[PDB]
Design an enzyme around this catalytic site. Structure first.
Site, PDB file in Angstrom:
ATOM      1  N   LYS B 113       0.870  -1.174   0.000  1.00 61.43           N
ATOM      2  CA  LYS B 113       0.000   0.000   0.000  1.00 61.43           C
ATOM      3  C   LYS B 113       0.901   1.216   0.000  1.00 61.43           C
ATOM      4  O   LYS B 113       2.014   1.172   0.552  1.00 61.43           O
ATOM      5  CB  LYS B 113      -0.887   0.045   1.261  1.00 61.43           C
ATOM      6  CG  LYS B 113      -2.195   0.765   1.019  1.00 61.43           C
ATOM      7  CD  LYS B 113      -3.194  -0.169   0.365  1.00 61.43           C
ATOM      8  CE  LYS B 113      -4.488   0.578   0.083  1.00 61.43           C
ATOM      9  NZ  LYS B 113      -5.550  -0.418  -0.132  1.00 61.43           N
ATOM     10  N   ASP B 153      -7.408   4.012  -4.341  1.00 66.52           N
ATOM     11  CA  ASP B 153      -7.898   3.823  -2.971  1.00 66.52           C
ATOM     12  C   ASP B 153      -8.514   5.184  -2.630  1.00 66.52           C
ATOM     13  O   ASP B 153      -8.903   5.910  -3.547  1.00 66.52           O
ATOM     14  CB  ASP B 153      -6.806   3.398  -1.973  1.00 66.52           C
ATOM     15  CG  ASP B 153      -7.375   2.833  -0.651  1.00 66.52           C
ATOM     16  OD1 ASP B 153      -7.795   1.650  -0.595  1.00 66.52           O
ATOM     17  OD2 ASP B 153      -7.357   3.592   0.351  1.00 66.52           O
TER      18      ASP B 153
HETATM   19  N1  LIG Z   1     -11.248   1.230  -4.436  1.00 69.42           N
HETATM   20  C1  LIG Z   1     -10.977  -0.073  -4.184  1.00 69.42           C
HETATM   21  O1  LIG Z   1     -10.902  -0.884  -5.116  1.00 69.42           O
HETATM   22  C2  LIG Z   1     -10.980  -0.622  -2.794  1.00 69.42           C
HETATM   23  C3  LIG Z   1     -10.832  -2.004  -2.604  1.00 69.42           C
HETATM   24  C4  LIG Z   1     -10.960  -2.542  -1.324  1.00 69.42           C
HETATM   25  C5  LIG Z   1     -11.220  -1.704  -0.256  1.00 69.42           C
HETATM   26  N2  LIG Z   1     -11.297  -0.366  -0.446  1.00 69.42           N
HETATM   27  C6  LIG Z   1     -11.573   0.487   0.723  1.00 69.42           C
HETATM   28  O2  LIG Z   1     -12.905   1.035   0.596  1.00 69.42           O
HETATM   29  C7  LIG Z   1     -12.961   2.278   1.310  1.00 69.42           C
HETATM   30  C8  LIG Z   1     -13.432   3.355   0.361  1.00 69.42           C
HETATM   31  O3  LIG Z   1     -12.499   3.550  -0.730  1.00 69.42           O
HETATM   32  P1  LIG Z   1     -12.932   4.154  -2.125  1.00 69.42           P
HETATM   33  O4  LIG Z   1     -12.071   3.530  -3.182  1.00 69.42           O
HETATM   34  O5  LIG Z   1     -14.425   4.114  -2.303  1.00 69.42           O
HETATM   35  O6  LIG Z   1     -12.483   5.681  -1.905  1.00 69.42           O
HETATM   36  P2  LIG Z   1     -13.086   7.048  -2.465  1.00 69.42           P
HETATM   37  O7  LIG Z   1     -13.753   6.858  -3.792  1.00 69.42           O
HETATM   38  O8  LIG Z   1     -12.127   8.138  -2.219  1.00 69.42           O
HETATM   39  O9  LIG Z   1     -14.276   7.319  -1.402  1.00 69.42           O
HETATM   40  C9  LIG Z   1     -14.009   7.397  -0.016  1.00 69.42           C
HETATM   41  C10 LIG Z   1     -15.333   7.802   0.654  1.00 69.42           C
HETATM   42  O10 LIG Z   1     -15.139   7.700   2.056  1.00 69.42           O
HETATM   43  C11 LIG Z   1     -15.164   8.989   2.667  1.00 69.42           C
HETATM   44  N3  LIG Z   1     -14.031   9.164   3.594  1.00 69.42           N
HETATM   45  C12 LIG Z   1     -12.717   8.965   3.285  1.00 69.42           C
HETATM   46  N4  LIG Z   1     -11.925   9.215   4.352  1.00 69.42           N
HETATM   47  C13 LIG Z   1     -12.745   9.578   5.351  1.00 69.42           C
HETATM   48  C14 LIG Z   1     -12.526   9.969   6.745  1.00 69.42           C
HETATM   49  N5  LIG Z   1     -11.269   9.998   7.216  1.00 69.42           N
HETATM   50  N6  LIG Z   1     -13.622  10.267   7.488  1.00 69.42           N
HETATM   51  C15 LIG Z   1     -14.864  10.207   6.963  1.00 69.42           C
HETATM   52  N7  LIG Z   1     -15.130   9.848   5.692  1.00 69.42           N
HETATM   53  C16 LIG Z   1     -14.111   9.541   4.861  1.00 69.42           C
HETATM   54  C17 LIG Z   1     -15.080   9.964   1.521  1.00 69.42           C
HETATM   55  O11 LIG Z   1     -15.632  11.219   1.910  1.00 69.42           O
HETATM   56  P3  LIG Z   1     -15.403  12.594   1.098  1.00 69.42           P
HETATM   57  O12 LIG Z   1     -16.270  12.321  -0.171  1.00 69.42           O
HETATM   58  O13 LIG Z   1     -15.843  13.634   2.136  1.00 69.42           O
HETATM   59  O14 LIG Z   1     -14.080  12.794   0.579  1.00 69.42           O
HETATM   60  C18 LIG Z   1     -15.761   9.236   0.386  1.00 69.42           C
HETATM   61  O15 LIG Z   1     -17.216   9.340   0.435  1.00 69.42           O
HETATM   62  C19 LIG Z   1     -11.553   2.492   1.887  1.00 69.42           C
HETATM   63  O16 LIG Z   1     -11.473   1.963   3.204  1.00 69.42           O
HETATM   64  C20 LIG Z   1     -10.664   1.698   0.934  1.00 69.42           C
HETATM   65  O17 LIG Z   1      -9.356   1.396   1.456  1.00 69.42           O
HETATM   66  C21 LIG Z   1     -11.224   0.176  -1.672  1.00 69.42           C
HETATM   67  O1  LIG Z   2      -4.660  -3.118  -5.992  1.00 66.33           O
HETATM   68  C1  LIG Z   2      -5.884  -2.826  -5.852  1.00 66.33           C
HETATM   69  O2  LIG Z   2      -6.741  -2.981  -6.742  1.00 66.33           O
HETATM   70  C2  LIG Z   2      -6.272  -2.235  -4.525  1.00 66.33           C
HETATM   71  C3  LIG Z   2      -7.743  -2.324  -4.178  1.00 66.33           C
HETATM   72  C4  LIG Z   2      -7.967  -1.693  -2.812  1.00 66.33           C
HETATM   73  N1  LIG Z   2      -7.934  -0.328  -2.799  1.00 66.33           N
HETATM   74  C5  LIG Z   2      -7.994  -2.526  -1.584  1.00 66.33           C
HETATM   75  O3  LIG Z   2      -8.008  -3.789  -1.648  1.00 66.33           O
HETATM   76  O4  LIG Z   2      -7.917  -1.924  -0.502  1.00 66.33           O
END
Ligand SMILES: NC(=O)c1ccc[n+]([C@@H]2O[C@H](COP(=O)([O-])OP(=O)(O)OC[C@H]3O[C@@H](n4cnc5c(N)ncnc54)[C@H](OP(=O)(O)O)[C@@H]3O)[C@@H](O)[C@H]2O)c1
Ligand SMILES: *OC(*)(*)(*)(=O)[C][C](*)C(*)(*)(=[N])[C@](*)([O])=O*
Ligand SMILES: NC(=O)c1ccc[n+]([C@@H]2O[C@H](COP(=O)([O-])OP(=O)(O)OC[C@H]3O[C@@H](n4cnc5c(N)ncnc54)[C@H](OP(=O)(O)O)[C@@H]3O)[C@@H](O)[C@H]2O)c1
Ligand SMILES: NC(=O)c1ccc[n+]([C@@H]2O[C@H](COP(=O)([O-])OP(=O)(O)OC[C@H]3O[C@@H](n4cnc5c(N)ncnc54)[C@H](OP(=O)(O)O)[C@@H]3O)[C@@H](O)[C@H]2O)c1
Ligand SMILES: *OC(*)(*)(*)(=O)[C][C](*)C(*)(*)(=[N])[C@](*)([O])=O*
Ligand SMILES: *OC(*)(*)(*)(=O)[C][C](*)C(*)(*)(=[N])[C@](*)([O])=O*
Lengths: 459, 459, 459
Positions: B113, B153
């Site tokens: 990460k 992310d």
């Molecule tokens: N993208 C992936 O493929 C992926 C895969 C697995 C897990 N994840 C996890 O899923 C979660 C969301 O990621 P995402 O890709 O959807 O990100 P993203 O598109 O940036 O959206 C993040 C969302 O969470 C809110 N947020 C972020 N930080 C915050 C904080 N410190 N306090 C309160 N609200 C907060 C944001 O609010 P604002 O709109 O106010 O900025 C936004 O609505 C994370 O935990 C990430 O690590 C993501």
């Molecule tokens: O490599 C990835 O596609 C990361 C996806 C992600 N943001 C996660 O698993 O937390």
């Protein structure tokens, strides 16, 4: 600035730019003017001295080039040309065209071109070997399977690809898909020799079906081809297979034309192929059978075929740039030619293109001569090179049927994309065929421009 | 030692370690304690200064990071986070979790990460571009298609991936799958935008089917979601498609809740998506239609959705770490919530997890709230990133249907693996649901530990 | 072939070739004709697009170049020119000349040149920074302390060297002598700013001593200089130190001439230096003291100084190529000029050279105007760059006295070599001064040709 005169490059640029301006593209996306200014300056060009030893032990000097024009959509991809005309202007026109051609294939390939002013004619195979060895000694620093993947073009066949690949492997100590057009046992693809000529004919099949509402095909049509190398040979073979007649081939010294009704046969094309492997002229084989049969064949020294074939239905220039003049375009129209597609890169002069396009605008439906640009119609070669890259990356070889099916699908999609894009951005009058040149140019350019923007090349 | 305090990392480590201890794993394989000590120290961490120029010409300084945690199973793989909270502690918790998540996908991906304390909020697109350019100027030394493959992310979308990819290609002179979440024309995968949210919902479908013996599904269930970015958006879309109701979304400033019975629609999610592309808050769109309709929507400033949605069946925290408190967990239980799965990494506080797990142990069958950890439920994103890598290495693009089918199979296998592993090593009382958190942790950890042993990382 | 028109390069080549033919060189070593054909094709040329951002946030595009002409005697070495005239032709003339100039220094330096059509005039320092950053992002792939070592030239000062060095160090992660003209605290050499202008004057001291049998020196001579940048400034300072009078300087917009007897002072040169740091014209400072004093200074818009200085003893063109016409050469002769040495590369037109050389052949001893070519007289700059490389490789800094002593010895040896080589291969009539242009050309060419033969570049 203080820029040098590059006529071929300027020609290619002007035709692209004109088609973009003569559409609604810059009304919808005026910011694409910036994209055009950026895309038209190559990302990188390497030029290098090539010293090589001739069969008498003398030092010979030629100039080598690789134009790495654009890499938004993939690693740089395009052929090597060994011809005494070669210079930066020529390679830039080719590399520029390659960007947009490659975009039309749907595969991840950027645009490039290279080569040398080395003339393979009059050289021994040993001399060609020593030249390819020296050439690649420098070129290998700049290319690679995820960087820049060359191939053949005018004067570069499987023989030269082999010598080039060998030297790359020796210096770089990697066996990979750094070149395409490779041999069957060392990473080549079935259908790659056929691909460009087959693809040109596949594309024209779609043009005929659309213009004639399914009523006509290549069956029974007379097809005038120029050149007698890789593109011309296989375009001729596909025409024959579809029941068409091939009524001309040519080379740099003259044209070999069918006298009356009839066609080149596969057996005759094979004899011409073997002649060209030996780097000999058509003039050298017309003194013996079968080509000495003056009832089947007419050899015309110093001529292009277009004014000598009489009535024809399809013209496939497949030799070199600027090989159909404005006058020749008018004679083809007067001869009943309804389909003209470029096997050769920039095969039509601008005068020819303007003549064909004016005719399309003035004549409804099937009465028009329909012009398809090389970036659409000749894209089958580079498409199958992409598939050769895919096969090398999979470490497996596909069947002839698998490669050919994919080639057919790519040519269909390319035609559809150019047709539909023209209908959207340069909508023709009712009953008028859409411009495949305008459509293809817009479709290739916008895909590249948008990917460049995403990647921060312009903003 | 003299180790710094890293609370987020310590939290993630402690929860993993506790689940391993509360099982028969170390009775069967006490040597895995050594594996745990080794795996918990990252193989490599790079930190670097990022100097960039703002729109006024001023020098700005941020901190960049890449944690390359473990590479037994494959090249390092995991996203980039641009958020003002970012530090080493946070990126280590994320990278640690990523190791075991990636193990559960069945694809060859190690765990990493990275990111920066750069805050995209209040920046122009031009500023984001200059930042990504500077960031990747350093990061490109440390990553590559067979080394380390980042992605998005929090705060890193397709826009940032594009600027990052462009700069990598420029310096490294290689066009390859060094990043995932790429654009459609430059090596992206269909289904990648959808993948994480779709996968969370696919996984929960299996949880519902198992807990209810096939009697219930998402059809007719009320689903509370937090966040409104990539994961929340597509989880909401899949819920809607399956006949469920989405009753909340949120962001860092407040929650947007459905008032009574009803659901967000696809059209509303698209409007929220476009708002978030512009880096604006939900608060900025509730003054106009459709979100000003106070009969459908309630905007609650400064709140999380959990205590405001009333009765709900499923909760999918999809924003950020530690976003469900112990108190919030109890209210969800009291509201009838029977399924809670983390879209967000470490979405539940430890207090929440303990509350959910105590409830599972105290309540037979479908009466229990069943908790699925992010490493299982949110693995669809990284899984489809693996498939994007596979597509780039094949040099071909797959269909939406092909990618989605593989994603469905991966989520099914991940669920089965966690369920069966828990049944084997942490066997629940008769009638009690097995612990998906314990099962998933053991299954991911053992696969990694065994591969590490094979490769001589520990002995 | 099909070669582009490169007038500047062709000019430089023709003058070298003519001097070689007009000697006994090819009688003794006719095989050197082969060497000439090989040496005249550059080993490598890199051209590249440079996209950079202006102060308004707009995308700007310029062309970048590096000509790596010859490496027999050492790594490629030569400056970078940022001027709107820049193209391949110009950089090839410069790089070609550089090969033979570098040979005359006695240090192991091959010949190269590069730069861009970027115009520093009208740009902010911030814009220059962003341009240098983008430029070096690509150039750093092709250069290095044992490969190619650039430096300044027209439009590239210590400021630009600094921005270039910084970006190289950032990407390449090596701190080394990849550039010369570096700053004092980060690997620069004392005497490097002075070196070119000092060296031109040192060389002419030898010319005066020889032609006049020790009777005259710079003491009391009137010296017309053109340009007002690095070479002109320090040539003027050395003239002043030796008791000579500097009676002109110029820039691209006009000439600033001493009105009557007198000289620029060191204090005035410093004011002009500070003006040029700010990229302003001489025209901008003639409205205030001291340059508004019309009794000391005459500013002539649009003029070169040669016809306006009246009687002069020495002319040192120090601006740009082709800045002394055939007519201007005749007026200098008519004004009593007996010594003309090129500070600028190819400062004299061919017409000028022919005029000076005809005069030398027609006039015995001190009555002749004696022409020294830039490759001999301006070699002090690149010589001290070689010493900067030596210092960086030693990881120590030498004193001003040490560097200056070595520079004096190099200029003496260069003069002696050209004089003695001309006496040997192009022996003048009794009483006639030997041709320093012929001598210098033969001495540089033969050293390079012989090293090339040893290394197998030709045989
Ligand atoms: N993208 C992936 O493929 C992926 C895969 C697995 C897990 N994840 C996890 O899923 C979660 C969301 O990621 P995402 O890709 O959807 O990100 P993203 O598109 O940036 O959206 C993040 C969302 O969470 C809110 N947020 C972020 N930080 C915050 C904080 N410190 N306090 C309160 N609200 C907060 C944001 O609010 P604002 O709109 O106010 O900025 C936004 O609505 C994370 O935990 C990430 O690590 C993501
Ligand atoms: O490599 C990835 O596609 C990361 C996806 C992600 N943001 C996660 O698993 O937390
Ligand atoms: N090969 C590919 O996959 C591919 C793909 C797309 C487009 N193209 C284009 O197709 C065209 C033909 O290429 P190719 O691969 O078939 O090359 P090739 O095998 O070398 O054949 C070239 C043919 O054109 C003739 N020719 C070449 N230069 C000429 C000139 N300056 N004047 C007159 N005739 C000339 C040759 O005559 P001689 O026999 O007298 O030498 C020969 O018959 C080119 O425009 C090329 O760029 C090729
Ligand atoms: N620097 C070195 O170590 C070195 C070594 C050997 C030879 N040289 C040669 O010496 C000459 C001067 O270089 P430099 O380092 O002194 O450069 P510099 O500091 O940029 O100064 C160049 C001077 O020449 C003028 N000039 C440049 N291009 C011109 C044009 N096209 N027309 C009219 N005037 C022009 C400039 O006018 P503006 O002030 O109007 O811009 C300026 O006064 C060049 O020929 C260079 O290649 C330099
Ligand atoms: O890379 C290639 O296969 C090049 C094919 C070709 N010569 C063309 O498209 O012009
Ligand atoms: O490498 C250098 O120091 C170049 C000096 C110079 N500009 C020249 O010789 O033209």
């Amino acid at each position: 600035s203080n820029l040098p005169h590059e006529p071929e490059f300027e020609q290619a640029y002007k035709e692209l730019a004109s088609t973009l301006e003569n559409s609604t593209l810059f009304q919808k996306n005026p910011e694409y003017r910036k994209a055009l200014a950026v895309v038209s300056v190559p990302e990188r060009v390497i030029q290098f001295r090539v010293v090589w030893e001739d069969d008498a032990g003398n030092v010979q000097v030629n100039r080598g080039f690789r134009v790495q024009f654009n890499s938004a959509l993939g690693p740089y991809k395009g052929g090597l040309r060994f011809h005494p005309s070669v210079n930066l202007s020529i390679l830039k026109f080719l590399g520029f065209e390659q960007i947009f051609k490659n975009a039309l294939t749907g595969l991840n390939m950027g645009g490039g071109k290279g080569g040398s002013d080395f003339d393979p004619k009059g050289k021994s195979d040993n001399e060609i070997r020593r030249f390819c060895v020296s050439f690649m000694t420098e070129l290998c620093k700049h290319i690679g399977a995820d960087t820049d993947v060359p191939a053949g073009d005018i004067g570069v066949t499987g023989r030269e690809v082999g010598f080039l690949f060998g030297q790359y492997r020796k210096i770089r100590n990697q066996w990979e898909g750094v070149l395409t057009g490779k041999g069957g046992s060392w990473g080549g693809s079935l259908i790659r020799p056929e691909a460009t000529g087959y693809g040109v004919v596949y594309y024209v099949e779609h043009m005929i079906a659309h213009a004639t509402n399914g009523q006509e095909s290549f069956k029974g049509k007379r097809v005038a081809i120029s050149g007698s190398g890789n593109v011309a040979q296989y375009a001729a073979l596909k025409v024959i297979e579809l029941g068409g007649s091939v009524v001309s081939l040519s080379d740099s010294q003259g044209s070999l034309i069918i006298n009356g009704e009839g066609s080149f046969t596969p057996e005759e094309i094979e004899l011409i192929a073997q002649t060209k492997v030996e780097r000999k002229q058509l003039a050298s084989i017309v003194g013996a059978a079968p080509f000495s049969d003056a009832n089947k064949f007419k050899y015309i020294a110093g001529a292009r075929p277009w004014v000598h074939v009489g009535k024809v239905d399809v013209a496939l220039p497949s030799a070199t740039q600027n090989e159909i003049s404005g006058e020749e375009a008018q004679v083809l129209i007067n001869a009943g030619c309804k389909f003209i597609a470029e096997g050769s890169n920039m095969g039509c002069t601008q005068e020819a293109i303007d003549t064909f396009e004016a005719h399309r605008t003035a004549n409804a439906g099937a009465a028009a001569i329909w012009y398809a640009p090389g970036k659409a119609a000749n894209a089958g070669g580079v498409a199958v090179s992409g598939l050769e890259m895919a096969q090398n990356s999979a470490r497996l070889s596909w069947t002839s049927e698998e490669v050919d099916a994919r080639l057919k699908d790519i040519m269909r999609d390319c035609f559809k994309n150019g047709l539909e894009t023209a209908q959207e951005y340069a909508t023709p009058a009712e009953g008028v065929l859409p411009s495949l040149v305008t459509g293809s140019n817009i479709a290739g350019f916008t895909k590249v421009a948008a990917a460049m923007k995403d990647q921060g090349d312009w903003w």
